């Protein structure tokens, strides 16, 4: 009712716990499963979606409340993935050659990013604080950056010649660039092929969980070298058969959802803070 105003909440420590709300949330919420194409290839069944839906119903989710989205690979999924379900679970296959990319993908879907546009042709750009990054996404991103001194002159680069710039990305379908804060950089990006945005990390995204299928703990969703937090929304499982992975996901859907929370930003209370 009172939107856009932060009112303190003064609950008491003695009020009794309420009954479980898990069943009601399962009845009123929708779940999205994101998996790679090789999963559906290995499973090799035209009705596996229906079987998984029936099993989820055995776990309490109403029929039709679970959606199964497919993506080719991590690179294709990193092209502004749109996660719209109340609860999103991304079955991300591990690849030792695509560690950073994997992290980048996680860093984009496990967090909240307030993004404003970037016209590299018009203005120079600097990153104000540690929470500010430059997220670029599209068919192929090649970001070259020229730091500028107080004399708006390139440092180790010429403003006029982009060949002297410094390469931070190459043919990337998603890259999060972190440059030194408080320095104006001239940017040369393949704007025709991909778009760049100045994005502030507000905080975690609670409705998105990432299950790393195979590998080890390699995700680093923080630009800070000193911190590599493995949050409760980053699971890891060893696998041989994709049917096993999906049975594990459906069996422990309770635990997976417990690790997640309703998107704080997408709900009525967030009205005139950012949305809804």
């Amino acid at each position: 009712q009172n939107y856009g105003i932060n009112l303190p909440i003064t609950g008491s420590m003695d009020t009794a716990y309420a009954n479980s709300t898990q069943e009601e949330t399962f009845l009123t919420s929708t779940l999205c499963l994101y998996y790679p194409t090789e999963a559906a290839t290995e499973i090799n069944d035209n009705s596996w979606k229906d079987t998984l839906s029936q099993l989820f119903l055995t776990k309490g989710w109403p029929t039709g409340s679970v959606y199964f989205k497919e993506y080719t690979d991590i690179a294709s999924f990193s092209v502004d993935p749109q996660l719209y379900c109340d609860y999103n679970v991304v079955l991300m296959k591990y690849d030792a050659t695509l560690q950073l990319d994997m992290s980048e993908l996680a860093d984009l879907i496990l967090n909240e990013w307030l993004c404003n546009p970037m016209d590299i042709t018009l203005y120079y750009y600097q990153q104000t604080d540690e929470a500010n990054k430059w997220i670029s996404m599209g068919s192929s991103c090649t970001i070259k950056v020229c730091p500028l001194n107080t004399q708006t002159l390139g440092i180790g680069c010429l403003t006029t010649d982009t060949a002297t710039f410094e390469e931070v990305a190459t043919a990337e379908k998603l890259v999060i660039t972190d440059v030194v804060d408080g320095v104006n950089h001239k940017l040369d990006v393949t704007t025709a092929t991909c778009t760049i945005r100045n994005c502030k990390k507000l905080g975690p995204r609670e409705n998105v969980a990432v299950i790393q299928v195979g590998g080890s703990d390699v995700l680093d969703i923080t630009a800070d070298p000193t911190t590599a937090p493995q949050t409760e929304r980053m699971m890891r499982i060893n696998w041989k058969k994709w049917w096993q992975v999906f049975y594990t996901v459906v069996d422990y859907v309770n635990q997976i959802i417990q690790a997640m929370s309703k998107r704080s930003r997408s709900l009525n209370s967030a009205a005139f803070y950012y949305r809804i």
Binding site: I9, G11, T15, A16, A18
Partner: protein, 542 residues
């Protein structure tokens, strides 16, 4: 008047019995049409012969037959179309032997007393285009005699067996509405049932050890007759939509709101508007009636189909609403609490001893308003004292009586009635009528009071002064002792006493919601009681 709700729940089992047969089955003006009809019909025969040399028939059975004709009715040449079919037939058989030579009849159908003959009938007359909304329908017809005729069998060898004899009398028993499926339109028709009675002519087959067999085989049931005729009269009463006394539709093919709406959306406003014209004392009189199923559902001017299923449709919708599930959960909680001394830990008591009536539950809790714990406890308890109302564990007249009285006086006045509107308006009314209602329990000249809104009051009967509310005593009193609906709840009682000094007997009766004192106060035009009952009626807003 609350009894109706209970009875619906009590009778809900019969609803299941209905569904079975159903899934085995498959303003307004009254205008009369008594017509002298002549049903001319006939049967058809399916004679499918088996392979071999032709000595064996695989089937000789009945087949529905259509007929068209024209006849005179009150000087009108009326064209009529009929379709005759049969049901419940006896599959006799003849088995001359296992050889291909021997006469064998795998299965031949004979209609006997256990069979029935159905005849759809239609004509281009007025009566048969006014029968979309029908109040009553009843047809009488003179019985007819259908005799079986000769039918020789095509054997190329030896004597030709002949199927002679066989006869049944068709006697009219029941007429209903039915449909005829044409190429591009659908016609409303009158379907007549006829019970069969075996008659003296016994059918036998020559060249066989078959004689003195009774019925009417399907071989040649027409006996060469062009048609079988029954003459009679059918009475129909049609409900034609009319909004004025000078017009009357020739045909009633008009669309009604329920031909286009399955979820009543604006009829809620119709009910809320109807609430204005409700009298007060007469509403109490109606609320004191033990409104049973018959009393509740007898006064509705229904159609032929609607009256046939009003009670069970209402009850089908009734045994799904929040009220029925609350009753079920209360019963299950009581049975579980009685069924195990194991989980007195799981349940937490706001009384001396554990009871399903006295347990605290989810209560997501409302930080919007500064709420005391006692308020939450009392509200949670009152929300089950409602099931006490609907469990015959109350003493005075309850809010459910008022809800039922309002429901009755509104459904009778409401012009919006249909086989789907009365369901979901009785149930949703019982769910949404008087949502905020208070209860009181008396003990040692002291009254405890709780409300679903969270307001609680302790006071003394002799003088209405509030007392420190003693939770854990109101709970023990309310789990066992009679619970009284607060029609004249504390605030109104204190106002009345201060302004209209009431006697000890009057206060005694008002506390226990005695109808007599309520109606006497209403008749005196006492503003306070009239205001309280007005608030209660306006709360019955669906």
């Amino acid at each position: 008047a609350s009894l109706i709700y209970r009875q619906l729940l009590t009778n809900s089992y019969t609803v299941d019995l209905s569904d079975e047969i159903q899934e085995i089955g498959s303003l307004w003006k009254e205008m009369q049409y008594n017509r002298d009809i002549t049903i001319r019909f006939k049967f058809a025969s399916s004679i499918v012969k088996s392979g071999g040399l032709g000595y064996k028939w695989s089937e000789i059975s009945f087949k529905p037959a259509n007929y068209q004709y024209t006849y005179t009715r009150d000087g009108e040449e009326v064209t009529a179309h009929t379709t005759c079919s049969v049901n419940g037939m006896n599959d006799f058989n003849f088995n001359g032997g296992s050889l291909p030579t021997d006469f064998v009849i795998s299965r031949y159908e004979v209609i006997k007393e256990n069979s029935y003959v159905y005849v759809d009938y239609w004509d281009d007359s007025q009566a048969f285009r006014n029968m979309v909304y029908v109040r009553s329908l009843a047809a009488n017809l003179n019985s007819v005699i259908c005799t079986g005729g000769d039918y020789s069998f095509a054997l190329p060898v030896g004597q030709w067996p002949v199927m002679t004899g066989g006869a049944v009398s068709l006697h009219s028993a029941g007429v209903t509405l039915s449909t005829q499926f044409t190429d591009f339109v659908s016609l409303n028709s009158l379907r007549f049932r006829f019970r069969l009675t075996v008659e003296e002519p016994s059918f036998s087959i020559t060249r066989t050890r078959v004689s003195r067999l009774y019925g009417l085989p399907a071989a040649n049931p027409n006996n060469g007759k062009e048609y079988y005729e029954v003459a009679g009269r059918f009475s129909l009463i049609s409900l034609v939509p009319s909004n004025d006394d000078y017009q009357t539709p020739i045909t009633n093919s008009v669309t009604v709101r329920q031909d286009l709406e399955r979820q009543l959306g604006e009829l809620r406003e119709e009910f809320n508007a109807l609430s204005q014209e409700i009298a007060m004392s007469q509403l109490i009189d109606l609320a004191l009636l033990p409104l049973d199923m018959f009393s509740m559902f007898s006064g509705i001017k229904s159609t032929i189909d609607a009256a046939k299923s009003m009670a069970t449709s209402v009850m089908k919708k009734f045994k799904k609403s929040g009220l029925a599930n609350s009753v079920s959960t209360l019963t299950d909680s009581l049975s579980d609490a009685a069924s195990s001394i194991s989980r007195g830990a799981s349940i937490r008591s706001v009384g001396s001893s554990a009871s399903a009536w006295t347990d605290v539950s989810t209560q997501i809790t409302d930080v919007s308003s500064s709420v005391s714990s006692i308020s939450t406890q009392t509200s949670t308890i009152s929300r089950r004292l409602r099931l006490k109302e609907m469990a015959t564990q109350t003493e005075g007249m309850n809010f459910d009586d008022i809800s039922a009285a309002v429901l009755k006086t509104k459904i009778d006045r409401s012009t919006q009635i249909s086989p789907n509107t009365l369901p979901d308006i009785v149930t949703e009314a019982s769910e949404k009528f008087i949502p905020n209602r208070a209860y009181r329990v008396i003990n040692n000249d002291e009254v405890f009071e709780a409300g679903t809104d969270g307001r609680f009051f302790a006071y003394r009967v002799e003088t209405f002064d509030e007392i420190p509310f003693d939770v854990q005593k109101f709970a023990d009193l309310v789990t066992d002792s009679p619970v009284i609906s607060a029609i004249i709840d504390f605030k109104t009682l204190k106002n009345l006493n201060d302004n209209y000094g009431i006697s000890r007997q009057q206060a005694f009766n008002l506390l226990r919601s005695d109808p007599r004192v309520l109606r006497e106060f209403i008749n005196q035009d006492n503003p306070i009681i009239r205001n309280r009952i007005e608030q209660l009626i306006m709360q019955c807003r669906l």
